């Protein structure tokens, strides 16, 4: 039934595809020493620099140890070679449900209980990963790789690996939707507050159902609008003056005026 190893054998690849990128294939997998089904991914290695690679392999052993309800659990990370080409295996916790983006796809508007809910589940894990020792920053933190655990389930924070491979200093080409960035994520200047931005523009996709600045066509239009302070069309469509007033104190311009994390749990909204 499988079609890959992990060396020790501790899991194995199937050949039944669950997601895709430019980069990344991800295949099911299997836990021998748990009996649990994981998330195989591949990563193709040609493509990862020697600066970004060894740091995958200092990274990995950090993001093992990290046990967080809030957080997708990894397990492990090595290199691979298929047929002919070069790969790096990601194995984190197999989440089937989904992510945000389809959940907001499947039901089109989100009810508030239920935003609250998870925003603050957000939030716990975001916590958790800036309390850790030294402190872990998302980078890369959007609604595809925030990862529902069921349709009434809370919300677990995925991606962790691929963070690192987030390339903002990188010139990447004009191809299907632009993604928005924080003002400093050009600059390579950054730190906690990078992903509070992250967080209020999550928040707002999960408000308004729709994505940040759909008005511009490419990343260059969405970069002159975020470093001037022209927020987005989609930032007027929200109908809670609460909700709205969170979200406009998370993307600000200047990551010194952004609210912290502690702030936002001892928040009116979020009790
Ligand atoms: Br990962």
């Given at each position: 039934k499988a079609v890959g190893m992990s060396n020790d054998g501790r899991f194995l690849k199937f050949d039944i595809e669950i997601g895709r990128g430019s980069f990344k294939?991800?295949?099911?997998?299997?836990?021998?020493?748990?009996?649990?089904?994981?998330?195989?991914?591949?990563?193709?290695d040609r493509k990862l620099t020697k600066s970004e690679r060894q740091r995958?392999?200092?990274?990995?052993?950090?993001?093992?140890?990290?046990?967080?309800?809030?957080?997708?659990?990894?397990?492990?990370?090595?290199?691979?070679?298929?047929?002919?080409?070069?790969?790096?295996?990601?194995?984190?916790?197999?989440?089937?449900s989904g992510t945000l983006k389809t959940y907001l796809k499947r039901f089109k508007v989100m009810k508030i209980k239920v935003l609250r809910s998870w925003c603050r589940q957000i939030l716990k894990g975001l916590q958790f990963l800036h309390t850790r020792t030294p402190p872990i920053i998302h980078r890369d933190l959007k609604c595809d790789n925030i990862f529902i655990t069921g349709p009434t389930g809370s919300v677990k924070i995925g991606d962790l690996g691929?963070?690192?491979?987030?390339?903002?200093?990188?010139?990447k080409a004009v191809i299907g939707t632009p993604e928005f960035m924080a003002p400093e994520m050009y600059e390579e200047k950054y730190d906690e507050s990078v992903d509070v931005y992250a967080f209020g523009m999550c928040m707002l996709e999960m408000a308004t159902s729709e994505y940040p600045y759909?008005?511009?066509?490419?990343?260059?239009?969405?970069?002159?609008?975020?470093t001037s302070?022209?927020?987005?069309?989609?930032?007027?469509?929200?109908?809670?003056?609460?909700?709205?007033?969170?979200?406009?104190?998370?993307?600000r311009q200047n990551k010194?005026?952004?609210?912290?994390?502690?702030?936002?749990?001892?928040?009116?909204?979020?009790?």
């Open positions: 294939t991800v295949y099911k997998g299997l836990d021998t020493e748990t009996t649990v089904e994981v998330a195989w991914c591949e990563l193709q995958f392999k200092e990274e990995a052993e950090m993001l093992k140890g990290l046990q967080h309800p809030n957080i997708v659990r990894f397990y492990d990370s090595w290199e691979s070679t298929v047929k002919g080409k070069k790969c790096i295996v990601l194995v984190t916790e197999l989440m089937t691929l963070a690192t491979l987030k390339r903002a200093s990188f010139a759909s008005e511009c066509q490419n990343a260059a239009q969405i970069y002159r609008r975020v302070g022209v927020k987005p069309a989609s930032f007027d469509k929200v109908a809670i003056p609460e909700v709205k007033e969170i979200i406009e104190g998370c993307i010194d005026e952004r609210y912290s994390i502690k702030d936002l749990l001892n928040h009116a909204f979020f009790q």
